[model samples]
Each structure stands twice: as C-alpha cells, then as structure tokens.
Target: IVGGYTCGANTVPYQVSLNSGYHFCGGSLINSQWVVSAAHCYKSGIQVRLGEDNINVVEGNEQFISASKSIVHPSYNSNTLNNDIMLIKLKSAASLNSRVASISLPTSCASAGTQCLISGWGNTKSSGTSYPDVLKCLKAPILSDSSCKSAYPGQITSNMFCAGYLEGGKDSCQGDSGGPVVCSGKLQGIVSWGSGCAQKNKPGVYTKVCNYVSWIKQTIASN
Candidate 1:
C-alpha cells in the first residue's frame, strides 16, 4: 500500500494472505470456513493463509488451508470490473483464536467521508515497486461516487466506490487486490482496482461489499 506502515501483530486479525506458492492477494476471513476476496484473485492453486502478519517468515499463529470451493459473483464483469466480489470456502475451517478470526460485514452502507483502514502486503510505491514483508496499513476515507465517476469518467458503477486522497498520495497498490477496506471494524469493501496506483483524482476503487450482503448470506445458505 502506498504511504502505509507495518500493522502491529494481531491488529488486523481478519486479514488473510492468498498464496499460490507465493503471496498474491489479500482477503478477509468472513467465517471459520469461508473467505471474502475479489473475483480477480481466484486461481487454480490458491491456499488461504489466516492469522498471517509477516509474509517472509513463519508466524506460529498462521493457518494455511486450501480452497474447497470458490464462487465468483455471477454478475461480475471482466469488461467493466463490476461486481468484483468473490467467496472462498476453506477445505478445513479456521480455528478461531487471538490472532485468527472473522470480520463483520457492514449492516448498512458507509457514507462518504467515513474513516476506514486498508491493509495489505502490497507495493508501497504507486509507480514503481517495493513489497512489504509485514502487513502494511493506511487510513483513507470513503469518497463520494460522483467524485470517482468524474475522475474515471463513466467507468464507475454502483457496486464500486472510491476511497483515498484525490491529490494522490496514500492508497492501495498492486497485490493488495481482494483485501479488506474496514470501517468501524466491518468488512465494508474489497480492494478491486485503480488507475495508475494513486494518481491524481484516481483514488483506489473498491468492491462495495454493502451492496451484496443478502447475496452473500443467500449463497452461503444454499450452498
């Protein structure tokens, strides 16, 4: 994440690192057996690592589980990147503990200017590259839909929202995709995409998790 710093141990407990022999994306543990990530993060060999803080070293608290199943939102669009959310079911349920647990989904939509935290081990440089071994965090606020629509010009959708500085400083970057955007400790958004990292008027775009709360529950129940 651009302009982010290391997150203290167990601080973002629900955060998980997606790996396919390597750290690829970030996700939020929504339940013991299920994870919430981005559609774009799905691959054939994903292994969900819960209770992870540092990517480069073995953390005694970590749990590495392979995916039993993963479902991309049926409405997801690769062309426009709409409905970018995805659900991943673990082969074995995670054992909840001090450093491993689930995050709550937002009951209501987060309003503009709401303070939120975006955490990941992604690139710190927006333009170049510098990966963090430890989980990094940055605080950004929910920005108005109109602002992002104006910035991207017709690419924004209701299932998507923007958060970060319009002047382009702190934001989520590459490899942060599918990570959590938490507001009041609720899993409110998923790192979806952006233009040129944190370029001017181009804050990080996220999957608006609030819009699919019912779909999440329904899918979990039916499956």
Candidate 2:
C-alpha cells in the first residue's frame, strides 16, 4: 500500500496470507474453519497461513492450513466487479492464541467518514515491482457511495464501498486484494478492486461486508 509502514507482528491476528505456492493475496480469519477473501483471488490449490507477519520467513507461530474448499459468491461479476467476495473452508480448524485469532464481523454497515485501517503485504508504491516482506498498514477514511460514484461512474454498487484519500497517497494495491478493511475493530470491507494504486480521484473499492451478513451466515451454516 502507498504511504504504509511495517506493522507489528501479530497486531492484527485475523490477517492471513493467501498463498497458491506463493503469497498472492490477503485474507481474514472470520472463524476457526473459515477465511474470507475476494472472489477474484480464488484459485485452485490455494492455502492459508495464519499468525504470519513476514511472508519471507517461517515464524514459530505460523500455521499453514490447506483449503478444503473454496466458495465464491454466485453473483460475482468479473466484468463489473460486483460481489467480489469468497470464503475458504479449512481442512481443519485453526488453533487460536495470542498470535492467531478471528476478527469480528460488522453488525451494521460502515458509515461515511469512518476511519479504518487496511493492512496487507501489497506493493508499497504504485506499479512497483517489489513488495514488502513484512505486513504493511495505513489508515484511510470511508468515502460516501456518492463520492465514489463520481470517481467511477455507474460502477459503485450497494454491494461495494469506497475508502481512501482523495489526494491519492494511501491505498491498498495489487497483492493486497481480499485483505481486511477494519473499522472500529470490525470487518467492514474486503479489498476488491481499484483503478490504479493510489491514483487521484480513484479511491480503493471494497466489498461491503455488512451487505452479505445473511449470505455469510447461511453459507457457513449449510456448508
């Protein structure tokens, strides 16, 4: 992410590295056996690493788990980029501890101007080839859907929300997709899509978590 710095290890315990041989995206542990990420990040043989801060090193607290199954939302649209969310079911439940834990889901939708934090191992600069070894984090403000619509006309849907600086200094970039957008200690958004990393007038777009609360509940219940 642009204008981000290395975060403390295990500070955001729910943060996870979504790997398909290598770390490609970010995810959040919502439950012992479930991880939430962007539907676009789904790929065969994807696995998850929990309690990991640095992707390059094998930490003692890290737990690597194979994904038993991946469920992408049926309504996901690649062209429009709508409903860009997915769930990964673990083969076994994750062990919780100080270094590994699940994040709380939002009870309601996030309001405009709500300050939130986004963390991941995405690019530090726009279009940069190098990515950070340690987790990076930055604070951003939630923008109104109307303002977001102005940036990307006819693309902002109810299932999506926007967050970032208008001046375009801070944002989640490539490889940070499916990461958590935590507001008030709750999972509010899932990093989905954006125009370009930290581009002016083009804030980051995310899958609004509150809109899929029922779907998430039902999916987990029946699966």
Residue 87 in candidate 2, Cα distance off native in Å: 0.6
Off by over 4 Å in 2: none
lDDT of 1 by residue, 1-223 (tens): 9987788977899999999999999999998989999999878878999888888888788899999899999988988999999999999889998789899988999999999999998999977888889999999999998898988898999999999999998999999999999999799999999997878888999999999999999988876
Model 1 Cα shift for residue 70 (angstroms): 0.6
Encode model 2's per-residue lDDT on 54-117: one tens digit a residue.
8999877899999999999999999998999999999999999978999999898989999999
Lowest-sum lDDT 10-residue window in model 1: 50-59
* Candidate 2: residue pairs that collide: none
Provide the TM-score for each candidate, comma-separated: 0.98, 0.98
Q: How does each model score on lDDT?
A: 0.92, 0.93
Clashing pairs counted in every model: 0, 0
